[PDB]
Design an enzyme around this catalytic site. Structure first.
Site, PDB file in Angstrom:
ATOM      1  CD  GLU A  18      -2.470   4.324   2.468  1.00  0.00           C
ATOM      2  OE1 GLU A  18      -2.239   3.338   1.822  1.00  0.00           O
ATOM      3  OE2 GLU A  18      -2.968   5.261   1.815  1.00  0.00           O
ATOM      4  CE  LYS A  35       6.398  -3.720  -2.165  1.00  0.00           C
ATOM      5  NZ  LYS A  35       7.207  -2.457  -2.558  1.00  0.00           N
ATOM      6  CB  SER A  68       9.658  -3.312  -0.003  1.00  0.00           C
ATOM      7  OG  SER A  68       9.100  -2.054  -0.403  1.00  0.00           O
ATOM      8  CB  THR A  78      15.973  -4.796   0.280  1.00  0.00           C
ATOM      9  OG1 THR A  78      15.321  -4.261  -1.039  1.00  0.00           O
ATOM     10  CG2 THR A  78      17.305  -5.119   0.089  1.00  0.00           C
TER      11      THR A  78
END
EC number: 3.5.2.6
Length: 270
Positions: A145, A50, A47, A212
């Site tokens: 994915e 992002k 992540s 994170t």
């Protein structure tokens, strides 16, 4: 080189106890001194992409003054697992700015996929990173994915060094215009998912923003941050982990411990 790893730190013992690999880059923006361990190896973004996604949105908003205020409606089929903010606004919609904040501060997966579409997908985010001079970053897939974290697979990876260098450009340098730069910093400062990672190594009276990532497999998790110690220049750093077996667990404590070693190696009293 002369200012890299002036003081050695026991990163090898740390990763051996963890059972995997740790990658660390940290830069003192005042002097240019650095701490570097496995810093040019590839690790899965998870992540952590992002944060860069939100920066790319802010860059586009410099040319599209109505972008951040634009309301986005979405269907139930957009709501993939781990979408804690966007699930509460399914029946109302959310603005582009609100989706950006959710992706940054809660790792919201539906919000991230909606914003990726706005940018032209993984190749569009990769193109933004090339435009600021990052030749390492690659995004290839969508949520979920991109979390597969397969050993040796370069898809959806970067290096700790490139992550830190790009974070510096976006939060402290000139890659964003000044209002957008401060908005990016403010979103990172408001993150809610990082209290047990880099922030656990940073004294409470210093300002910090972070993003994170947790892939859920192959012991793969990470954090990157900008830190403002009082009375000296800011520090930028990245800590990435992985491990050889699919069911190896990640460790937040290992990320916090690696951040402590990085700050010690820079001579920053914490």
């Amino acid at each position: 080189h002369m200012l890299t790893n002036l003081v050695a730190e026991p990163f090898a013992k740390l990763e051996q106890d963890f059972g995997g690999s740790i990658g660390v880059y940290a830069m003192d923006t005042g002097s240019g001194a650095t701490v570097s361990y496995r810093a040019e190896e590839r690790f899965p973004l998870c992540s952590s992409f992002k944060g860069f996604l939100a920066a790319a949105v802010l860059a586009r908003s410099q040319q599209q003054a109505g972008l951040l205020d634009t309301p986005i409606r979405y269907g139930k089929n957009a709501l993939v697992p781990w979408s804690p903010i966007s699930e509460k606004y399914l029946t109302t919609g959310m603005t582009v700015a609100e989706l950006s904040a959710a992706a940054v501060q809660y790792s919201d997966n539906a919000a991230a996929n909606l914003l990726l579409k706005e940018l032209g997908g993984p190749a569009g985010l990769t193109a933004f990173m090339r435009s600021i001079g990052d030749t390492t970053f690659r995004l290839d897939r969508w949520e979920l994915e991109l979390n597969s974290a397969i050993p040796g697979d370069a898809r959806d990876t970067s290096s700790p060094r490139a992550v830190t260098e790009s974070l510096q450009k976006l939060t402290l340098g000139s890659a964003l215009a000044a209002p957008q730069r401060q908005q990016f910093v403010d979103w990172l400062k408001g993150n809610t998912t990082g209290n047990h990672r880099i922030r656990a190594a940073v004294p409470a009276d210093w300002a910090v923003g972070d993003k994170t990532g947790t892939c859920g497999v192959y012991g793969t998790a990470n954090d990157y941050a900008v830190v403002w110690p009082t009375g000296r220049a800011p520090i930028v750093l990245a800590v990435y982990t992985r491990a050889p077996n699919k069911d190896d667990k990640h460790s937040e404590a290992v990320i916090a411990a690696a951040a402590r070693l990085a700050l010690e190696g820079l001579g920053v009293n914490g």
